[PDB]
Design a protein around this ligand. Sequence first.
Ligand SMILES: CCN1C(=O)C=CC1=O
Ligand SMILES: CCN1C(=O)C=CC1=O
Length: 141
Amino acid sequence: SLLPVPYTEAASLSTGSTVTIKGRPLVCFLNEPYLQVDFHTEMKEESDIVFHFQVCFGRRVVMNSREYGAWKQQVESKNMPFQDGQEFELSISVLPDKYQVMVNGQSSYTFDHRIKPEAVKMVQVWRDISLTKFNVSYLKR
Ligand SMILES: CCN1C(=O)C=CC1=O
Ligand SMILES: CCN1C(=O)C=CC1=O
């Protein structure tokens, strides 16, 4: 809807930062839509990825990093709090030791830092969703 997808926004993250995304799947879970959020080290899409979050709605969630052009060890979770045909609010918080991902207010996934959050310069949100809101909190030093 409101925001274009793929959506790209230059960003800076540090401990205490929060990335909030509000959106909705474009098709029924039965047709398996995806959602992907990538934290890049450069403004270019072929750059390394500090945190890659991919949701196969109704199936699994996969998380990884791409360092020096190579994907590393994948982490998969079968935890699936997303609701079929519903709007969702995804919140990603930067803790000192890891990212904590909340879905509609409930802790659902965590991912220990492999590269310092300070290396992030861009965030891209894409795949089968409409995006109504995207916000990065620049509250802390
Ligand atoms: C929850 C029922 N539903 C779907 O499965 C896709 C759109 C919708 O409203
Ligand atoms: C290499 C494995 N992988 C992909 O191909 C996309 C995300 C991921 O972890």
